[PDB]
Design a protein around this ligand. Sequence first.
Ligand SMILES: N[C@@H](CCC(=O)O)C(=O)O
Length: 255
Amino acid sequence: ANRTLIVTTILEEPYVMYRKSDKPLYGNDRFEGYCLDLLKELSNILGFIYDVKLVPDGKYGAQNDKGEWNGMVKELIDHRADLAVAPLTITYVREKVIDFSKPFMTLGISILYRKGTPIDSADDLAKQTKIEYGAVRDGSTMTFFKKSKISTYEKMWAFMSSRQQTALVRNSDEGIQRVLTTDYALLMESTSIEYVTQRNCNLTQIGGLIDSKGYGVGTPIGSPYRDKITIAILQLQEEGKLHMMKEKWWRGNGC
Ligand SMILES: N[C@@H](CCC(=O)O)C(=O)O
C-alpha cells in the first residue's frame, strides 16, 4: 500500500524467540521477545507494518578475508531487508556498509564463566591455556578480538583463532552449553551475561566491560527510515518504555 517493511532478525534469547502456544501460530505471531516488543512499538510510532524473517545463515555479520560480508549485515547491504531489529552491535566497520539508529540498549564485551575460580579478568584467561575461551563466530565480539591491537586481546585472538574449530561457537546457545558442560569461558556481551547469570547461580561475569557500545536497528546505507527509527527510539526512552521492555524480558521474563 503502504509497503510492508521486511525485517531481518536472529533467534537469540530473550530478544527473539519462538512463542510457545497450544494453538498454531502464523507469521509474525510465531516470534516474541524484547526485539519483537520493540518492533511493535517502533511500528506504532512510525505507522508501518512489517514481515519478520530470520537471517538465512543465522549469523550477525562479519567480513571475510576476501572483503565479503555475511549475516544480517549482508541482508541489508543487498537490500533483502528494510530493517534489522536484533541485538545488533553498532561498530565502525559495520557503519561503513550499513546505517544504524541511535542505540536502544548499551552493553560491552565481558566474560561468562563459572564462579569459584581464581579467574578475575581477561588477563587471567590470556596468561594460561587449560581453560579454553572464545566467542560466537562472525559476530562483533569475534571481530573485536581479531582487529584488536591491545597485546592481551591480540594474545587472546591468537589462542581462539588457532583453536577456532572448538573455541569459536556457532551461536550463544552453544557457547553457554560449552561453559556449562566443559572448561570454557565465553566472551559475551554484558546484557546477555546478565540474562544467563540471573538464571544459573553457578555462572558469573568475570571482570568488567572490555568495551562500551550499543545495539542499534540496522538499515541499508542511505535509508530514510534510519533517522525516523532513531526519533522513535528516543521517544521510547523518554517514555520509560525501553526500561520496562528490558525489565519485562530480563527479570520478569515472558508474557
Ligand atoms: N551482538 C553481536 C553478536 C554477539 C557477539 O558477537 O558477542 C553482533 O552484533 O555481532
